[PDB]
Amino acid sequence: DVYAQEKQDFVQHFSQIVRVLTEDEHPEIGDAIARLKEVLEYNAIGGKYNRGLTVVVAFRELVEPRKQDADSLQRAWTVGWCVELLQAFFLVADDIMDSSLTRRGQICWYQKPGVGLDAINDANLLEACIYRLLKLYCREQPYYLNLIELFLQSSYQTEIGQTLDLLTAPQGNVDLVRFTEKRYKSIVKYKTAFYSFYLPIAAAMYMAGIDGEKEHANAKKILLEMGEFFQIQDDYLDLFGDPSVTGKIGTDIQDNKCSWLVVQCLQRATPEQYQILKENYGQKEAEKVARVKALYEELDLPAVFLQYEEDSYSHIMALIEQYAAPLPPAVFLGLARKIYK
Amino acid sequence: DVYAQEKQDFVQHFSQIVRVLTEDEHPEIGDAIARLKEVLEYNAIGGKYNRGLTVVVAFRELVEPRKQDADSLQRAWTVGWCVELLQAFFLVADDIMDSSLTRRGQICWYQKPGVGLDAINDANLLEACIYRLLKLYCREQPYYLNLIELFLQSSYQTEIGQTLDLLTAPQGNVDLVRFTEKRYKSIVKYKTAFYSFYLPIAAAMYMAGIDGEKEHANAKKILLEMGEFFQIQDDYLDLFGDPSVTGKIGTDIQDNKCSWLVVQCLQRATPEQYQILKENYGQKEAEKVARVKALYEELDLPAVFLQYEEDSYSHIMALIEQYAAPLPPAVFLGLARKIYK
Numbered sequence: 158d159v160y161a162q163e164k165q166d167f168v169q170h171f172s173q174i175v176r177v178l179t180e181d182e183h184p185e186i187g188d189a190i191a192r193l194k195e196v197l198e199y200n201a202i203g204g205k206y207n208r209g210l211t212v213v214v215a216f217r218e219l220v221e222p223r224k225q226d227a228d229s230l231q232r233a234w235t236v237g238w239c240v241e242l243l244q245a246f247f248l249v250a251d252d253i254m255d256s257s258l259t260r261r262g263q264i265c266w267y268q269k270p271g272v273g274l275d276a277i278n279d280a281n282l283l284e285a286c287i288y289r290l291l292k293l294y295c296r297e298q299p300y301y302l303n304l305i306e307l308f309l310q311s312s313y314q315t316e317i318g319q320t321l322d323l324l325t326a327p328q329g330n331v332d333l334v335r336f337t338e339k340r341y342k343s344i345v346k347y348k349t350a351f352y353s354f355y356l357p358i359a360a361a362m363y364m365a366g367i368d369g370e371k372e373h374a375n376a377k378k379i380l381l382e383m384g385e386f387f388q389i390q391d392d393y394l395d396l397f398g399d400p401s402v403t404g405k406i407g408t409d410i411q412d413n414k415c416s417w418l419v420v421q422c423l424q425r426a427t428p429e430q431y432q433i434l435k436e437n438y439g440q441k442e443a444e445k446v447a448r449v450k451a452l453y454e455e456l457d458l459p460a461v462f463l464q465y466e467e468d469s470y471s472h473i474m475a476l477i478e479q480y481a482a483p484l485p486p487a488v489f490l491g492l493a494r495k496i497y498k
Numbered sequence: 499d500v501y502a503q504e505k506q507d508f509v510q511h512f513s514q515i516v517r518v519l520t521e522d523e524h525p526e527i528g529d530a531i532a533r534l535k536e537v538l539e540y541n542a543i544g545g546k547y548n549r550g551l552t553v554v555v556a557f558r559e560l561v562e563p564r565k566q567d568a569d570s571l572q573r574a575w576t577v578g579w580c581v582e583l584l585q586a587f588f589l590v591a592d593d594i595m596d597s598s599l600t601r602r603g604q605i606c607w608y609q610k611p612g613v614g615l616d617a618i619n620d621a622n623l624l625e626a627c628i629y630r631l632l633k634l635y636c637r638e639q640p641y642y643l644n645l646i647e648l649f650l651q652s653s654y655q656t657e658i659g660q661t662l663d664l665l666t667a668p669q670g671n672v673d674l675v676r677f678t679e680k681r682y683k684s685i686v687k688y689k690t691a692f693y694s695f696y697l698p699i700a701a702a703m704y705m706a707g708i709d710g711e712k713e714h715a716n717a718k719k720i721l722l723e724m725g726e727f728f729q730i731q732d733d734y735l736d737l738f739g740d741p742s743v744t745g746k747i748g749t750d751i752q753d754n755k756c757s758w759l760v761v762q763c764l765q766r767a768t769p770e771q772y773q774i775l776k777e778n779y780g781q782k783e784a785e786k787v788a789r790v791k792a793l794y795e796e797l798d799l800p801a802v803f804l805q806y807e808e809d810s811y812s813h814i815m816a817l818i819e820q821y822a823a824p825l826p827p828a829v830f831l832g833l834a835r836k837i838y839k
């Protein structure tokens with residue numbers, strides 16, 4: 158199946174990404190260029206690569222095989238890596254802001270001795286590398302401007318979502334009245350759904366000459382719903398996932414987050430259970446985090462999630478029947494395979 | 499003179515910038531859009547506006563008065579504000595990374611109670627606003643892509659410079675062997691000179707249809723040298739400026755920075771003076787910072803700076819004679835008036 162079978166070529170392209178991004182070689186900036194290399198190697202490697210792979214997979218399925226020459230394929234791999242660099246940028250910053258410990262099975266970049274808040278600048282550089290690659294590989298192409306604007310708009314939407322995530326989770330401050338379903342859905346749409354799901358497909362679409370507003374709108378209808386489910390899954394796994402598989406320690410309860418779990422908890426709790434949540438949520442103490450987990454399990458939240466995943470899967474399939482044409486349904490189906498496993 | 503006489507119109511345009519950036523009005527994102535407003539108001543207001551004003555001034559001097567209609571003037575003011583938003587983005591992050599206390603006569607954004615490291619995301623949003631304004635005001639214009647690429651390339655160069663600034667100043671770590679003149683000049687060229695001086699002129703140039711590589715190269719020759727002097731001045735004022743005028747408390751010595759002052763100090767010190775510097779530089783203790791200042795004054799560094807400012811002024815004027823044509827020398831002269839006062 159198409160992801161595991163594009164992966165190896167995609168991952169190996171990375172050394173080429175790095176080599177080209179390292180050839181501002183103004184010898185004066187050598188030390189900075191060496192730091193950038195270290196940043197890329199630590200922060201763009203070690204995840205599943207699904208976002209960037211979706212660009213490559215979708216490209217193969219949308220573009221005429223006779224138009225898949227060596228050069229247009231290189232361009233597809235680079236644009237895929239651009240989506241991974243955007244993810245790297247976002248995660249480095251998000252880990253600082255969420256006070257996280259590990260990411261992708263290693264200590265977070267900013268927690269590394271000798272890095273600290275220098276990682277703010279490292280994250281901004283990763284972002285800059287996107288537009289540097291687009292220029293180096295794509296500047297002659299009809300879709301150059303489309304891609305630039307797509308990446309910029311995706312970043313803006315994600316930052317708006319991050320803003321809502323952060324505003325809804327003020328540190329050291331109760332009230333659970335904030336944590337509603339309406340609010341939750343807006344957060345994840347902006348913070349997750351656009352850049353994780355719309356962006357990589359849309360990018361492949363523009364690359365294939367599919368630039369019509371109506372087709373992008375239809376694709377977006379499916380892709381934003383997939384993104385909502387994916388963030389709900391990320392929230393569930395924050396508490397109930399195995400860190401050896403997720404690669405990261407969860408912080409949602411201590412960070413006072415509007416998680417899907419807390420929203421579902423609030424919908425189900427007796428007034429007595431509400432008070433337990435209220436006395437215990439949003440705080441660093443292990444014993445307090447453990448009481449919240451216990452309330453979640455008392456309320457059968459893992460069972461609620463398993464049932465939602467099934468409902469969500471069926472709903473997304475219904476949307477693909479409605480909205481996929483005229484693109485190959487396989488494009489969306491491959492994606493859904495990846496997240497609903 | 500042209501800056502004080504464009505200022506009032508420029509500053510008043512801000513409420514329009516804010517209003518337009520606040521009209522994603524998706525009511526769901528309202529809380530985020532209100533946070534953005536607060537971010538803009540705190541972080542883009544209260545400086546001298548010289549970078550954005552340079553766009554407006556240069557525009558009036560480069561564009562045929564018959565082509566200065568109401569709409570092209572609005573576009574000039576917006577692009578000016580784009581340069582100020584880039585500065586706001588950079589300063590918010592730089593203040594976190596330099597551990598600063600005040601900026602523009604108020605507490606730094608990230609030090610504000612209830613902000614903290616959320617300011618990382620606030621800074622990224624400010625950056626995103628640039629490209630949002632370019633699209634809203636400039637997308638139909640021949641120079642749209644030129645401007646996008648100029649802002650992106652300026653950001654990349656500045657981030658590379660920030661990288662060198664940070665690498666040369668490792669926290670808690672001596673050696674002064676790092677602090678050379680060669681190194682110093684590379685830092686400030688990248689971190690300061692491109693975005694502070696080349697960017698706003700270049701932007702006006704592209705807006706006026708002046709897109710020739712050779713003309714940009716000539717303009718850059720003057721503007722990068724002005725930028726070097728301006729950063730040298732910023733370093734001098736970090737220690738010897740009056741905070742009520744600069745608007746900020748200096749941190750260069752405690753932050754272990756490759757300041758122009760330390761570089762000049764190192765060039766002049768006896769081995770005994772070297773040891774004092776070495777025992778005292780790069781540390782939070784007021785008494786230690788005071789010994790470094792005392793060494794600087796013992797070495798007459800304020801007198802060395804006054805003499806350099808004069809030499810530098812004459813050199814820059816020589817470059818304007820050489821390199822200005824065919825642009826009006828007034829463009830560069832206005833700028834030099836602003837910084838050499």
Ligand SMILES: C[n+]1cccc(CC(O)(P(=O)(O)O)P(=O)(O)O)c1
Nearest residue numbers: 247248251255315319348349391395
């Ligand atoms: C910028 N951004 C957008 C969406 C998601 C994440 C990252 C997260 O999914 P978050 O739970 O913080 O939202 P992670 O820390 O759990 O990996 C970061």
Ligand SMILES: C[n+]1cccc(CC(O)(P(=O)(O)O)P(=O)(O)O)c1
Nearest residue numbers: 588589592596656660689690732736
């Ligand atoms: C990103 N960037 C580039 C150049 C300058 C500054 C800001 C400074 O000039 P720095 O002394 O830190 O270099 P300031 O704190 O003194 O205002 C920030």
Ligand SMILES: [Mg+2]
Nearest residue numbers: 251252255257
């Ligand atoms: Mg996180």
Ligand SMILES: [Mg+2]
Nearest residue numbers: 251254255322
């Ligand atoms: Mg987060």
Ligand SMILES: [Mg+2]
Nearest residue numbers: 391392395409
């Ligand atoms: Mg999470």
Ligand SMILES: [Mg+2]
Nearest residue numbers: 592593596598
């Ligand atoms: Mg600073």
Ligand SMILES: [Mg+2]
Nearest residue numbers: 592595596663
């Ligand atoms: Mg700095």
Ligand SMILES: [Mg+2]
Nearest residue numbers: 732733736750
């Ligand atoms: Mg300074």
